[PDB]
Amino acid sequence: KKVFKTEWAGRSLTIETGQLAKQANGAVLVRYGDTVVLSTATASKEPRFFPLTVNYEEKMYAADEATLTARLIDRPIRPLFPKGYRHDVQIMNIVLSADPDCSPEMAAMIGSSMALSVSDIPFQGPIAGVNVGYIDGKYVINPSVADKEISRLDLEVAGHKDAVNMVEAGASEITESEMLEAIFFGHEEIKRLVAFQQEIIDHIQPIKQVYAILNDLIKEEVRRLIADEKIRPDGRKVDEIRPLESEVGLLPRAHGSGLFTRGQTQALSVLTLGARFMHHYNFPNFSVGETGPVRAPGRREIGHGALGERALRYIIPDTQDFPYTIRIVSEVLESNGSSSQASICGSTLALMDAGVPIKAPVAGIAMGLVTRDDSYTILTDIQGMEDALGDMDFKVAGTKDGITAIQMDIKIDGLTREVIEEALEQARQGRLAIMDHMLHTI
Amino acid sequence: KKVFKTEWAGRSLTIETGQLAKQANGAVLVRYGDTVVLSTATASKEPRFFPLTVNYEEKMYAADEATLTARLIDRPIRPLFPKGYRHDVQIMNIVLSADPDCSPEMAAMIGSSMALSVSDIPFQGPIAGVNVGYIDGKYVINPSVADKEISRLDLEVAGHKDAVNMVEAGASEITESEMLEAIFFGHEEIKRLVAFQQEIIDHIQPIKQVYAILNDLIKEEVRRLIADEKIRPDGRKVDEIRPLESEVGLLPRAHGSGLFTRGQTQALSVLTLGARFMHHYNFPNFSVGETGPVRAPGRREIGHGALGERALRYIIPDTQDFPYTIRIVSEVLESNGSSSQASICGSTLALMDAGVPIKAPVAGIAMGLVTRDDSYTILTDIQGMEDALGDMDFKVAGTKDGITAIQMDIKIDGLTREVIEEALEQARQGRLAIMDHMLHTI
Amino acid sequence: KKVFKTEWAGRSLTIETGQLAKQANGAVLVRYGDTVVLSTATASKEPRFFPLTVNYEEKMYAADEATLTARLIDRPIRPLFPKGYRHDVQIMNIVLSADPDCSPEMAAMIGSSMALSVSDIPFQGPIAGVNVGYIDGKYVINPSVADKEISRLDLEVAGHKDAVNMVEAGASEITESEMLEAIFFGHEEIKRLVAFQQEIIDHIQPIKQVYAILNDLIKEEVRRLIADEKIRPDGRKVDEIRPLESEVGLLPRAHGSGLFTRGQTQALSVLTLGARFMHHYNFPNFSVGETGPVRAPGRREIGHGALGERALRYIIPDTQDFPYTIRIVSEVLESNGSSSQASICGSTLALMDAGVPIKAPVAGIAMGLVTRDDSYTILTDIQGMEDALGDMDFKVAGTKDGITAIQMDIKIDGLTREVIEEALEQARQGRLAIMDHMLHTI
Numbered sequence A, B, C: 001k002k003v004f005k006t007e008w009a010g011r012s013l014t015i016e017t018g019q020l021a022k023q024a025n026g027a028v029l030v031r032y033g034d035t036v037v038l039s040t041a042t043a044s045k046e047p048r049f050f051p052l053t054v055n056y057e058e059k060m061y062a063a064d065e066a067t068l069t070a071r072l073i074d075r076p077i078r079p080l081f082p083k084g085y086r087h088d089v090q091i092m093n094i095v096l097s098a099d100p101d102c103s104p105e106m107a108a109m110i111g112s113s114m115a116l117s118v119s120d121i122p123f124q125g126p127i128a129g130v131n132v133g134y135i136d137g138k139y140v141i142n143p144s145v146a147d148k149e150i151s152r153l154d155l156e157v158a159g160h161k162d163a164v165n166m167v168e169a170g171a172s173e174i175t176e177s178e179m180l181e182a183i184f185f186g187h188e189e190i191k192r193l194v195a196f197q198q199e200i201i202d203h204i205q206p207i208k209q210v211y212a213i214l215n216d217l218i219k220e221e222v223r224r225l226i227a228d229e230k231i232r233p234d235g236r237k238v239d240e241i242r243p244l245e246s247e248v249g250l251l252p253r254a255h256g257s258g259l260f261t262r263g264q265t266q267a268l269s270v271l272t273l274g275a276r277f278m279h280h281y282n283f284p285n286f287s288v289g290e291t292g293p294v295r296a297p298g299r300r301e302i303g304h305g306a307l308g309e310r311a312l313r314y315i316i317p318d319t320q321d322f323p324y325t326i327r328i329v330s331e332v333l334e335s336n337g338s339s340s341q342a343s344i345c346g347s348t349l350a351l352m353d354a355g356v357p358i359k360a361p362v363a364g365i366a367m368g369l370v371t372r373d374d375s376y377t378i379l380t381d382i383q384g385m386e387d388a389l390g391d392m393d394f395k396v397a398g399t400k401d402g403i404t405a406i407q408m409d410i411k412i413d414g415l416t417r418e419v420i421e422e423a424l425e426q427a428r429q430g431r432l433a434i435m436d437h438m439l440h441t442i
Ligand SMILES: [Mg+2]
Pocket: A337, A338, A366, A367, A382, A383, A387, A393
């Protein structure tokens, strides 16, 4: 994780990388004052017309428009790819925290530039954008909500080191000279922002670029290694949990937030208190390093949100002891096995971060199985491949004092009593280990 | 039609087959107390990745959630198909009547097992599910809504004769042993439910599994047999109506219901009273023995709902004599020609069932045409093939005293006055014949 | 532009062609009293099952149903196409002004007939439809909303010169003879309307029916002609605006309307006053002579509506001096570069039509560029091909006193200051010329 800081229009500008959304080609967290934006850039493995998609979304907890902002950010980026480049490139901008005086739109634009800049994609940037106002005869960079009310110009201009790349303006009937001056006043700031990004690029130094029978032979090799040689594809032992990392309080305008990472699975859960309890779960395709349609929550996202809500509902305080609504949203930023349990753990952190008087913290974990002729092997904290090539995905969440939720998917006829018993015990040990880590963080 | 009865958690469990949704591969009506669920299983004719889809819907008149339940029922079913089976299989569960103390989710799960078991699809069941509660230290099968409020466990468990295959639980922090005790307490009931299903299967004994030039010769033969030999593809006479069957009062929690069957066309219409008149029409793909997307009402269903509403609107009493809202929903469970008129007849039955003081009963029927030489033949109650290969689809509904609705689709340039007049006369005789039967039923 | 007038059920019937939607195969404006309906017919260039789609929409500003009305109009039209005809034919019906006593449905039915008749598509019409009521024992053509309340019959019947082609009725239990009399009373009016349509057809006389290297040589030829010979594909000069045409007050039940045409780009903007400011933009596929899905407004339509709203927002009077909501909807009836600007102009004419005390009229225009070596050429009022084959699409709108909106898309890395300077000045001259024309119209 690398943090780069500067100042922008009288407020702090930080760009973070290396920690969040590692399976996108490039990903960056932009903090502009209290505005926080996660920007990702992901490209298809092989080339597909150049298919570029830019998305912008302001989360409900951050406090047509988003369509206009995605079209805004697409413009200075689209023409700067090599001629003939046909890979499908998808860029996401998620406003996690929104201060209206610290333009989330412009933060997302430089986030989208930086996401691409560190990314692996041959984008010919960097670019940056600024908002220019025109107040009492003086041009201003990124005016506050108050200043924009007395501004005769609502100009957003973007470009690179060499030239202006985009002009998007509304104005109170200003002359051609007044506009022209505003534009190249804006481009002076753009050159500073592009220089700031280039410092980051210089430091980071991104590097730019019968079947079915085979599929069964790999399945048997993974299963043989596990049952016989006692070793898992990532070198783990059968009861080994992946490396754990965790933080709270990542978002200034949220009541509570928790970041929980387990191996290659990472979830950001954001809590909102209002004036009863709900938990939602979002699974972007950049979480698994892919592109594709940005659709409404599918069947799986509805399930995993309800499973998280079920595990957590039992420790939520009553209304007499906590007279507030509680909404938690879990964002899966990276996934390689049980994002849904990571969302449960992130939500517990966010509940404690927000000072919600819960009965007890809750953590979860998913168990696996490799069945063989004479015996079987329980796998603790399975990754995706062990789900795909194993025999079950057995998810258990609860407190130190017992179970609050179970959900199971198996690829065999059934689980014997001994399998279920052994899995529940390893899962009891697993959740206890995870909460020891979470209480260490909290 | 065969009815099989038992007792389940202190309430009656009935499974019916042979009457409803005969064009699905397998179909079953489950009655669990006042809960009523129709479950169908339909497979693609040819095999296609194994595409299995399970659907669950609680109808508005029965009284995220439905997604979780379809997700619930898929789990114990999916792994029990032969390895390498690639037919597209769709399972539909329609909650027609819902008593919250008599689990519609569990009723639908055994319905889906039952639908598959009698179906011809090589499903390796049967399976069954139960809900297990935990109240003052004792496990209970399918607790009532009141009992679940004092329950420390919300466990739903499914499996087959030999093993448990699915566990989905919420719990007030119960230990691993307590959960284990609940699972195999539930599985004792599952083995009883699967044994009951096997009794039904033992009795029923399901058996398990230039082009354009040709079509014109087929069309030419059906039309030739009709015009020359006066015989229709099913052997009917040109003015012969298909066998009629009808009952009332099928749903305990509905204000009125009518089941109307005409040959291979079957509609169940459900009426709801409230505190002005609407008729809706649903056409599931299993009604014609197919699979496919479950979409919102298409143009045809909207058309056929409005045509049903038109035929019926005229005999609905004034508010002074009946001060209630009336919503009727007609479910096409099978189709082979004019489901829309069957829905009209089903709706009239439901109106008389509900004790709605209608002006007069209403029946409908669809007429056809085969034009030849200069001669022609009017067909009474056309099936699908006579619509496709004939010249018109001429639908007339009304009372014994006259016409209340007409809708027509033709495949030739126009209908002469003489064709229209003779068709109207045969349809007058038709609706009178259908109505004589409906009053016999009512 | 040709206008054909007659009388229909005691109200005026006008059919207009030659002015609106010229890029559809056939397009017609029908005025039936105060009802105004635009009807278009467009066919795919090559044939694809005969795919015919009929669409019907009543605009909100004109004052299940639209689906039923579109199916209504499809029926008398569908069977009257040549056997074996496989071109995709799409008919759109847009109710721009709605008087409920002058049936928009029947206006749309004869509009769809006329659209196809003048179209080049081998539709074997014309057809027409009428509404027949039955009041105190007398049949009446197209009864008023009041008269329909005392009518025992709500019959819609359609057909051609030779026969009735469609019967759709609801009725208060009328006999077969009463229904039969109604149909052929209606067909007496149909033959008169079909004769009226036939007069127009006689008058108009419609006539009835390495790749990558090649595209790059065409692009180089357009750019070569522009930069060297100064000649544009339509023979225009680089600073020449396309011919302008403009009218105001096209819709009787709208508070204001403006029609603005610029070459092959045409927009109709409709203003509605209520008891704050919004501008929407619609882009039908017939505007460029194509067929295809009728979807919700896409990203471009959202963008172009907001850009129009942005150009206009600045001249909207304050609430203190104009206490009304203002809604404008701009319909792109024909397009060949910058419809977004056509909407702005249309909107301004409309605001003036509606007597909205705007600060100043607003006009817009789109500029292009052909870059050659170190040389370049600014293009005034670019058509679609000069956008596709040029270097920018630079849109500037404003008043006589300055700029109110700018939006730009470029196909090169950046725009030098002098290019931006040259574009703004030519665009300033452009909008002044357009506004000189618009004030002449107003
Ligand atoms: Mg897992």
